[PDB]
Every structure is written in structure tokens, then in C-alpha cells.
């Protein structure tokens, strides 16, 4: 999680898309969706990012509709944005035990139990928190079984990005679970 305000420069694809849906939260604008292999993904926009400006206009108090409107009108050639990185999220680094567990239980992405004397317990993992990312890979909308698989196929060191469940549930309001499963970018980021 980068701790300040960064600039990104986007270019609409051939179809006039940038691969983004935005959501009004708390009189700010936040990324709700980033499409796989989109301009948004390529420049490193992530679920939960806060859009502070689009082409030098403040996003404060915009509706989701106005934000999507503003992206439609923009000259495709070059869109600038100012971004706060995942400001509602935090990162937690854990170490797997000899049996391959970081030490928590979760249901529909939300951590529900912390196991006594686990890495999760020592690193202060919290319940009623939704898993957004595992080792920088977005897992939002993936089945519980696949999130377990991605945890099992990570090394002994597991970084998990988490969001308070209330906040997460407010952000994904009005996005179909199939769009999340199907289109939400879940690739290991390119270099």
C-alpha cells in the first residue's frame, strides 16, 4: 500500500473502454471493478483505489453516475488521474506453520475466526474483514475453494490485503457476483 497521492495516465482501448467502474463512498470516488487486460489494469489501478482527480477536476462529492459520465466524455488520447492507493485496506504478513496454515477460517471472503497461537494471531489479523488480495493478486469474487488454493500454492510467506467488511460490502453494492468472478482482474500483475 503506497502512502500518498500518485498520478496515472490512461489511454482508452480500441473499443473506447478503460476497464473501470467507480463507486461513490463518503463523498469520494473509489474503484469497484478493474477489468482484466484493460488500460486501468495495465497502469496498475486496483480495487479500492481512491480517485482524487480526473483530468485535473476534483472527484469530491461526485455520484458514481457523474464519474462514469466524465470518463465517457474524456478525449480517449490521454486521461490523467490522481490516486490514493487502497486507502480503506491494510496488508498483513504471516508465516505458514509446519502443516501449511497461517491460522484463520473465512466464509465468502470474510475472515470469521482467528486460530489460537497462529501467525494470524501473532500478526493481529482481524475477523469481519474481507480478503481483497493475496500476495498482490486480487481474489475478490473468486470461490472460497480457489482462495484456499491460492493460499496453499503461495510460499511460507503470505501477504493478505484486507478491508473492513462493512466498507467492502458498501463498495461492491450493485455489482453482480458473476462480473466479480468473471471480469474482476485476478492476474498476477505484469512486469
Ligand X SMILES: COc1ccc(C2(C(=O)O)CCOCC2)cc1
Q: How far apart are CA 84 and CA 54, in angstroms?
A: 13
Q: How far apart are CA 120 and CA 100, in angstroms?
A: 12
For ligand X, the closer of residues 92 and 172 by Cβ is: 92
> Does the annotation place 143 within a ligand binding site?
yes
CB of 158 to ligand X, least distance (A): 9
Q: How far apart are CA 126 and CA 15, in angstroms?
A: 42
CB of 160 to ligand X, least distance (A): 12
**Contacting residues toward ligand X, per CB under 6 A:** 94-95, 119, 122-123
> Does the annotation place 135 within a ligand binding site?
no
> Does the annotation place 181 within a ligand binding site?
no
For ligand X, the closer of residues 94 and 172 by Cβ is: 94
Q: Which of 184, 114, 98 is nearest to 146 (CA)?
A: 184
For ligand X, the closer of residues 123 and 137 by Cβ is: 123
CB of 98 to ligand X, least distance (A): 12
The residue whose grid cell reads 450493485 is 174
H/E element, 157: strand 157-164
For ligand X, the closer of residues 81 and 102 by Cβ is: 102
- For the chain, the distance separating the N- and C-terminal CA atoms, rounded to the nearest angstrom, is 18
Residues annotated as binding site? 108, 143-144
Amino acid at each position: 500500500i503506497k502512502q500518498g497521492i500518485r498520478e496515472v495516465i490512461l489511454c482508452k482501448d480500441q473499443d473506447g473502454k478503460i476497464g473501470l467502474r467507480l463507486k461513490s463512498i463518503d463523498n469520494g470516488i473509489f474503484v469497484q471493478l478493474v477489468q482484466a487486460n484493460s488500460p486501468a489494469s495495465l497502469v496498475g489501478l486496483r480495487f479500492g483505489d481512491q480517485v482524487l482527480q480526473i483530468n485535473g477536476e476534483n472527484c469530491a462529492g461526485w455520484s458514481s453516475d457523474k464519474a462514469h459520465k466524465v470518463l465517457k466524455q474524456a478525449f480517449g488520447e490521454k486521461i490523467t488521474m490522481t490516486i490514493r492507493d487502497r486507502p480503506f485496506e491494510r496488508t498483513i504478513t504471516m508465516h505458514k506453520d509446519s502443516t501449511g496454515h497461517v491460522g484463520f477460517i473465512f466464509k465468502n471472503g470474510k475472515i470469521t475466526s482467528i486460530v489460537k497461537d497462529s501467525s494470524a494471531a501473532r500478526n493481529g489479523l482481524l475477523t469481519e474483514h474481507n480478503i481483497c488480495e493475496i500476495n498482490g493478486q486480487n481474489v475478490i469474487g473468486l470461490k472460497d475453494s480457489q482462495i484456499a488454493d491460492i493460499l496453499s500454492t503461495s510460499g511460507t510467506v503470505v501477504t493478505i490485503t484486507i478491508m473492513p467488511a462493512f466498507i467492502f460490502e458498501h463498495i461492491i453494492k450493485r455489482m453482480a457476483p458473476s462480473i466479480m468472478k468473471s471480469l474482476m482482474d485476478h492476474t498476477i500483475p505484469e512486469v
